[PDB]
Scaffold this active site. Structure first.
Site, short mmCIF file in Angstrom:
data_model
loop_
_atom_site.label_atom_id
_atom_site.label_comp_id
_atom_site.label_asym_id
_atom_site.label_seq_id
_atom_site.Cartn_x
_atom_site.Cartn_y
_atom_site.Cartn_z
N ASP D 104 0.88 -1.20 0.00
CA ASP D 104 0.00 0.00 0.00
C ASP D 104 0.91 1.24 0.00
O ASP D 104 1.87 1.25 0.79
CB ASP D 104 -0.96 -0.02 1.20
CG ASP D 104 -1.98 1.10 1.20
OD1 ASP D 104 -1.88 1.99 0.33
OD2 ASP D 104 -2.86 1.08 2.08
N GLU D 120 -4.26 6.37 -11.26
CA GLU D 120 -5.63 6.48 -11.84
C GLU D 120 -6.63 6.00 -10.79
O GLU D 120 -7.39 5.05 -11.07
CB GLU D 120 -5.71 5.72 -13.16
CG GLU D 120 -5.25 4.27 -13.08
CD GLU D 120 -5.64 3.39 -14.25
OE1 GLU D 120 -4.76 2.68 -14.77
OE2 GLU D 120 -6.83 3.40 -14.62
N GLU D 129 -13.31 7.11 -4.89
CA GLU D 129 -12.42 5.92 -4.75
C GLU D 129 -11.18 6.30 -3.93
O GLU D 129 -10.22 5.51 -3.93
CB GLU D 129 -12.08 5.33 -6.13
CG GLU D 129 -13.22 4.52 -6.73
CD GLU D 129 -12.89 3.78 -8.01
OE1 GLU D 129 -11.75 3.91 -8.50
OE2 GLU D 129 -13.78 3.06 -8.52
O1 LIG Z 1 -18.11 3.51 -13.71
C1 LIG Z 1 -17.92 2.35 -13.44
N1 LIG Z 1 -17.36 1.98 -12.27
C2 LIG Z 1 -16.95 2.97 -11.27
C3 LIG Z 1 -15.42 3.03 -11.26
O2 LIG Z 1 -15.01 4.19 -10.53
C4 LIG Z 1 -14.90 3.14 -12.71
N2 LIG Z 1 -13.52 2.70 -12.86
C5 LIG Z 1 -13.09 3.01 -14.24
C6 LIG Z 1 -11.57 2.89 -14.33
C7 LIG Z 1 -11.14 1.59 -13.72
C8 LIG Z 1 -9.85 1.15 -13.97
C9 LIG Z 1 -9.41 -0.05 -13.43
O3 LIG Z 1 -8.16 -0.52 -13.63
C10 LIG Z 1 -7.56 -0.41 -14.92
C11 LIG Z 1 -6.40 -1.37 -14.95
C12 LIG Z 1 -5.19 -1.27 -14.27
N3 LIG Z 1 -4.48 -2.33 -14.57
N4 LIG Z 1 -5.23 -3.12 -15.44
C13 LIG Z 1 -6.41 -2.50 -15.65
C14 LIG Z 1 -10.26 -0.81 -12.64
C15 LIG Z 1 -11.55 -0.38 -12.40
C16 LIG Z 1 -11.99 0.82 -12.94
C17 LIG Z 1 -13.39 1.25 -12.65
C18 LIG Z 1 -18.28 1.31 -14.43
C19 LIG Z 1 -18.79 0.06 -14.04
C20 LIG Z 1 -19.10 -0.86 -15.01
N5 LIG Z 1 -18.94 -0.58 -16.29
C21 LIG Z 1 -18.46 0.58 -16.71
N6 LIG Z 1 -18.30 0.84 -18.06
C22 LIG Z 1 -17.74 -0.17 -18.98
C23 LIG Z 1 -18.32 -1.58 -18.84
C24 LIG Z 1 -18.18 -1.67 -20.37
C25 LIG Z 1 -18.41 -0.15 -20.37
C26 LIG Z 1 -18.11 1.57 -15.79
C1 MTA Z 2 -6.74 0.95 -11.68
S1 MTA Z 2 -7.72 1.00 -10.23
C2 MTA Z 2 -6.47 1.52 -9.10
C3 MTA Z 2 -5.39 0.46 -8.91
O1 MTA Z 2 -4.56 0.93 -7.86
C4 MTA Z 2 -4.62 0.05 -6.74
N1 MTA Z 2 -4.71 0.84 -5.49
C5 MTA Z 2 -5.79 1.50 -5.03
N2 MTA Z 2 -5.50 2.11 -3.85
C6 MTA Z 2 -4.22 1.83 -3.55
C7 MTA Z 2 -3.28 2.15 -2.46
N3 MTA Z 2 -3.65 2.92 -1.41
N4 MTA Z 2 -2.02 1.66 -2.54
C8 MTA Z 2 -1.61 0.89 -3.57
N5 MTA Z 2 -2.41 0.56 -4.60
C9 MTA Z 2 -3.70 0.99 -4.64
C10 MTA Z 2 -5.83 -0.84 -6.96
O2 MTA Z 2 -5.67 -2.13 -6.35
C11 MTA Z 2 -5.89 -0.91 -8.47
O3 MTA Z 2 -5.01 -1.92 -8.98
#
Ligand code: A1BLK
Ligand code: MTA
Ligand code: A1BLK
Ligand code: MTA
Lengths: 303, 322, 309, 322
Positions: D104, D120, D129
């Site tokens: 963390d 992000e 978040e």
């Molecule tokens: O708004 C939503 N959720 C709230 C959340 O705050 C939004 N964020 C977005 C960025 C993100 C990035 C992540 O990580 C990336 C990453 C790192 N390493 N590998 C990948 C993980 C989660 C999120 C959720 C939400 C929920 C369901 N569907 C959609 N839309 C798509 C479904 C097909 C259209 C949106």
């Molecule tokens: C892409 S969504 C944000 C990413 O960062 C990670 N993350 C969120 N909060 C923290 C934190 N406090 N320290 C380290 N990684 C984090 C989550 O596990 C996810 O992989």
């Protein structure tokens, strides 16, 4: 036969002060838990690290005395709805500090002002306080019949008191309360301490506060006229209201200094005891119904 | 997570036997740390952790007069409402000898290190009021050769039968939560109409200070209870013993119960379904102490003569907040 | 110190120099068993706050909100009790005897000011009332409820018994004149702006004065200009007091709840800044004996002296 | 408080527009920090905080090739399941250039300090978040003159009318909790059948790094919305804009919505009772951001044209866990 206490914004010795007001014939004392002029800083050094004690000790009175005779007053400097960032945060902290200390003492009730229209942040702090921890203290909201603005003498030459017909205007102190209690989803621990001015409003305003949770009515010394001898007394319009409040079984709070200098304070109080023991005595229906007042009963099938 | 009310402090200040015992635990520790040849040269730095309204502070001052050894006092208290009461005693009576500290002991950065740390954080089940977590966080400011009062405490369990107390718990169901939640939490209770089915065996023990290099306050403990009548299991009574210092001790374990001490009642871990038990059979109960960074909780289960469901998994029904 | 109090209350509220060079202290107890206050004279000003080396002292029923000198012997006191108190200084200046103590305000008396004559005073309170006193007759001549909120500060004009300012939590700055049938007149900047917290009349022109708002801003007003000529962000917090120097081209001393003292020229520009206090800066008076020496008192019980460039 | 599933990461890795924008935010920051005269002498130390499966790490490597400036990468991730995926990329492909840190960011004790921190952490309402709390704790290892990507984000609210979405929320009542709980929490939702009653105004803003000496991430914000039809208030749509770097930005605010970016849907703060609103009247909504040491939550209320009850007092219905 009449329950009544005394508001003071000054207490040098809580021992002697409470001893005096009880000797005067009162049932309880509304007083500050922290010194009203003792502002506290909660964020910015050095004022932050002010050495203690932050207030007087809880050892000075018994639990029985704290639980029955004392009613807390939020320090007047606490303004949670200030448009100034710093004063807002300090009053947020100050209020929890003041309310928490009231819970610690185990006070039966605590007084808070409604003296402006926007109390959105005062309501939230209190709402968080009521849902934070477990206690059944009461919260007496100090609301005036007539806003202080519409009670002021017409003596500001370049901003005069608009004399015009104002129906919805002269009710506004009720919308203050209604907005406040609504934000607090009608909490049973939020009630009204109704402050009365020298000038009553029109009956239509005194008709609003019908149905509302009035635990207290605050009579300032001001409103008391004097009679032939020197006894303090009230108008026939302030008496009509006292008789209606008595029906509701509210506690009476005498506030402000002695203006009938020749006689003591148990004279103001004597008059209330006089009014009380003279009121239209209870009839046939009202004597059998005594106790059932606003008591709900589920529907019972007689078949 | 919550501050104690003035009138709560008041009552628990009035148990003389508890504060007699704490006075003595210091009296004996003072004499063992500073020789008579050093009685005016050596001043002992002594910290009441969770000082309250300061009956432990007063008691430390009585111990000093008793042993005629020199001491300096810190009174660390989290509850600021209490701190008002301390700082008022500090001014009026105690004076410079007693420092006051309005702080959580886990947080406080100490000006100097302590000879002796003195706390009464014990619950009815010993570690349930989180004495371990508080003293663990506050030990890094204890001298390398320093004493804790208390040094040791131990929790004790015994199976009980009471269809009366089973009703009292069942009726603790409330709207807006799991309708069995009332069973997955411990109740402090002056047990009266009940039947102790076996001699209390010890459950969990803790030592202060905690030498072990990888500190861990989680526990798992299997207990087996011989049962010599037919009966129905309704719950488990919890008690504790604690070593304040040497042979000085407090106990609510009925066998060794400190005479006339009302400070603590027993706890009760109930079970959802009452378990029938027959003459000769063994009740086997299992107890876990669990924790996050945020909360600490007990889970528990019966594995003999029949299995129960695991009570309070995840601390879902009951957690104590750090 | 015949009689007097054994110990001085933690919270120093007021600090005023005589024409002699003597120093008057108001002190309140804002925490602990006893919530009272006390008056002190110091014929030696470098001795204070020390209670042992004072010329005279006395204990009041209740804590002191504001103070002021009334000639050389008179001391006017705004009590928490809701009373105004006149304490007359002794023959040999060893005692301090209560001359009158009148309970007229229904709440804390928050501010007092003496009018040019020195026969009359005006008291502002939390009851929202303002009152004009005859200090000879010991009575309220007039009682004006101008405001809709507790009165913060009232300041008598240098040269007119008729005129004085008041400022309140209702956002109003009033200019009074007891000769009008509607005395009060609302004045200030073009905008609403933050609450007024402090009022200093300029010594040479009844024309102009400065007010401090709760957001730590000092502003300069000309009464007939009727517009805020000048402004500056002086303090991080509430401005609790403004005091002009006895100098020819007089300097402005500026108090705050950020525990700092500021000193500003006629254009409100920082000359001096002191962080010598570690609690609210409460009052200021300049030495009449040395015009460049300035004395401040805090809730930190520090009586501090400053040399001012 | 919970780790993201592999297939969740998968989908959000496939939004090219979002990672185009992050690639560029670095590309432009690299050129502004290391002159061309220093392109081989100066190596920039660059930390992906919340690296995930490392699409931000890959993007940082693409930015380096674009700007031809030298960089060293840390990839700090809390989710150990993801860290498996990083350490496998680290070995097979990236190599020594990319350090991996299974930690963390609030906890990690950094070996060196960072030029640029890249995260992000943004939710649909920006700070929901807990981007502020994470970067606040991890900024003490950012260089005195160092950049945050993002530097700025802002939440936006607009009142909405949808008797359809009011039903969808009402039907989220569940046994074993406050029967109005479903109203005192925000729902992520692809708003469709609704009516925006006013232009979105901004609610809360945050800056990184946070200069202010007394850091505080709590907020209170009064918003007033002109309404120019008769209608019924059912809730408030939430959106955000963020400054990654300079003129590079992401936005889901419909006016300035980044084209083709599906990463975030809008949020919805509902209200218990629908409020009738008439042509000309002002909707006045109030929003608080609140926090313990343990949890962060929004409370909110309508004060015009009628008062609502304060939603989610104490975070009773809804909290986000630190
Ligand atoms: O708004 C939503 N959720 C709230 C959340 O705050 C939004 N964020 C977005 C960025 C993100 C990035 C992540 O990580 C990336 C990453 C790192 N390493 N590998 C990948 C993980 C989660 C999120 C959720 C939400 C929920 C369901 N569907 C959609 N839309 C798509 C479904 C097909 C259209 C949106
Ligand atoms: C892409 S969504 C944000 C990413 O960062 C990670 N993350 C969120 N909060 C923290 C934190 N406090 N320290 C380290 N990684 C984090 C989550 O596990 C996810 O992989
Ligand atoms: O067992 C109980 N509660 C569980 C809790 O763990 C027990 N502990 C005891 C010590 C203590 C000491 C405190 O502080 C002292 C102090 C510091 N400064 N000033 C005072 C505070 C609380 C407790 C509760 C409990 C609950 C109700 N009644 C009784 N019995 C008495 C009622 C009249 C018989 C017991
Ligand atoms: C006598 S009950 C224990 C006393 O110690 C205080 N206390 C409990 N836990 C802590 C802690 N972690 N730090 C400081 N004081 C504590 C409580 O507020 C109470 O006054």
């Amino acid at each position: 036969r009449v329950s009544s206490g005394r508001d003071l914004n000054c207490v040098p010795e809580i021992a002697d002060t409470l001893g005096a007001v009880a000797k005067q014939g009162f049932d309880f004392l509304c007083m500050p838990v922290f010194h009203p002029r003792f502002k506290r800083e909660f964020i910015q050094e050095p004022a932050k690290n002010r050495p203690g004690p932050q207030t007087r000790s809880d050892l000075l009175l018994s639990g029985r005395d704290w639980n029955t005779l004392i009613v807390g007053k939020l320090s007047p400097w606490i303004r949670p709805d200030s448009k100034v960032e710093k004063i807002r945060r300090n009053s947020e902290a100050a209020m929890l500090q003041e309310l928490n200390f009231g819970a610690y003492l185990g006070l039966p009730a605590f007084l808070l002002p409604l003296n402006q229209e926007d109390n959105t942040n005062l309501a939230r702090v209190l709402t968080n306080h009521i849902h934070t921890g477990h206690h059944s203290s009461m919260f007496w909201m100090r609301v005036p019949l007539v806003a202080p603005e519409d009670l002021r003498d017409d003596i500001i030459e370049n901003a005069p008191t608009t004399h015009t017909e104002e129906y919805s205007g002269e009710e506004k102190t009720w919308m203050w309360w209604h907005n406040f209690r609504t934000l607090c989803d009608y909490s049973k621990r939020i009630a009204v301490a109704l402050e009365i001015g020298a000038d009553l409003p029109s009956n239509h305003v005194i008709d609003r506060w019908l149905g509302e949770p009035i635990k207290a009515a605050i009579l300032p010394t001001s409103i008391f006229l004097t009679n032939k001898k020197g006894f303090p007394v009230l108008s026939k319009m302030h008496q009509r209201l006292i008789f209606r409040l008595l029906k509701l079984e509210v506690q009476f709070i005498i506030t402000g200094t002695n203006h009938h200098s020749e006689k003591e304070f148990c004279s103001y109080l004597q008059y209330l005891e006089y009014l009380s023991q003279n009121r239209p005595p209870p009839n046939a229906y009202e004597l059998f119904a005594k106790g059932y007042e606003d008591y709900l009963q589920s529907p019972l099938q007689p078949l | 997570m919550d501050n104690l009310e003035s009138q709560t402090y008041e009552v628990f200040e009035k148990d003389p036997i508890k504060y007699s015992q704490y006075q003595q635990a210091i009296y004996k520790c003072l004499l063992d740390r500073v020789p008579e040849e050093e009685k005016d040269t050596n001043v002992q730095v002594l910290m009441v952790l969770g000082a309250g309204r300061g009956p432990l502070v007063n008691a430390s001052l009585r111990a000093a007069k008793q042993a005629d050894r020199r001491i300096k006092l810190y009174a660390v208290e989290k509850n600021p409402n209490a701190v008002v009461t301390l700082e008022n005693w500090q001014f009026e009576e105690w004076g410079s000898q007693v420092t006051v500290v309005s702080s959580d002991m886990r947080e406080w950065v100490a000006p100097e290190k302590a000879d002796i740390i003195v706390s009464e954080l014990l619950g009815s089940f010993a570690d349930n009021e989180l004495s371990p977590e508080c003293l663990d966080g506050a030990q890094h400011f204890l001298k390398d050769d320093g004493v804790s009062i208390p040094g040791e405490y131990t929790s004790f369990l015994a199976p009980i039968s009471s269809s009366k107390l089973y009703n009292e718990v069942r009726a603790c169901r409330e709207k807006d939560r799991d309708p069995e939640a009332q069973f997955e939490m411990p109740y402090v209770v002056r047990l009266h109409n009940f039947h102790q089915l076996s001699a209390p065996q010890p459950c969990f023990t803790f030592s202060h200070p905690n030498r072990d290099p990888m500190i861990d306050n989680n526990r798992y403990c299997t207990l087996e209870f011989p049962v010599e009548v037919n009966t129905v299991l309704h719950g488990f009574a919890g008690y504790f013993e604690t070593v304040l210092y040497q042979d000085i001790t407090l106990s609510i374990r009925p066998e060794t119960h400190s005479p006339g001490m009302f400070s603590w009642f027993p706890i009760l871990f109930p079970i959802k379904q009452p378990i029938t038990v027959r003459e000769g059979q063994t009740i086997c109960v299992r107890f876990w102490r669990c924790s996050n960074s945020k909360k600490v909780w007990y889970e528990w289960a019966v594995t003999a003569p029949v299995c129960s469901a695991i009570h309070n998994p995840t601390g879902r029904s009951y957690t104590i907040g750090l | 110190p015949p009689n007097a109090p054994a110990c001085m209350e933690r919270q120093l509220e007021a600090a005023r120099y005589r024409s002699d060079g003597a120093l008057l202290l108001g002190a309140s107890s804002l925490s602990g068993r006893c919530w009272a206050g006390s008056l002190w004279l110091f014929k030696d000003p470098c001795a204070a706050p020390n209670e042992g080396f004072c010329s005279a002292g006395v204990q009041t029923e209740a804590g002191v909100a504001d103070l002021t000198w009334v000639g050389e012997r008179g001391i006017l006191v705004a009590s928490d009790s809701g009373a105004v108190e006149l304490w007359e200084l002794d023959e040999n200046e060893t005692l301090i005897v209560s001359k009158f103590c009148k309970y007229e305000h229904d709440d804390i008396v928050s501010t007092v000011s003496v009018l040019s004559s020195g026969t009359q005073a005006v008291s502002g309170s939390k009851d929202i009332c303002i009152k004009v006193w005859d200090l000879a007759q010991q009575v309220v001549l007039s009682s004006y409820r101008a405001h809709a909120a507790q009165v913060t500060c009232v300041a008598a004009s240098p040269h007119k018994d008729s005129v004085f300012l008041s400022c309140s939590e209702d956002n109003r700055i009033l200019l009074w004149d007891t000769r009008c049938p509607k005395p009060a007149s609302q004045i200030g900047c073009s905008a609403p702006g933050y609450l007024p917290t402090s009022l200093a009349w300029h010594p040479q022109q009844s024309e102009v004065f400065v007010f401090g708002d709760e957001n730590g801003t000092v502003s300069l007003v000309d009464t007939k200009s009727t517009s805020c000529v000048l402004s500056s962000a002086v303090h991080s917090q509430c401005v609790t007091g403004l005091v002009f120097s006895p100098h020819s081209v007089p300097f402005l001393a500026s108090l705050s709840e950020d525990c700092s003292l500021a000193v500003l020229d006629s254009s409100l520009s920082e000359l001096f800044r002191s962080q010598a206090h570690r609690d609210f800066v409460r009052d200021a008076t300049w030495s009449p004996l040395n015009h460049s020496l300035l004395t401040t008192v805090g809730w930190d019980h520090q009586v501090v002296h400053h040399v001012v460039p």
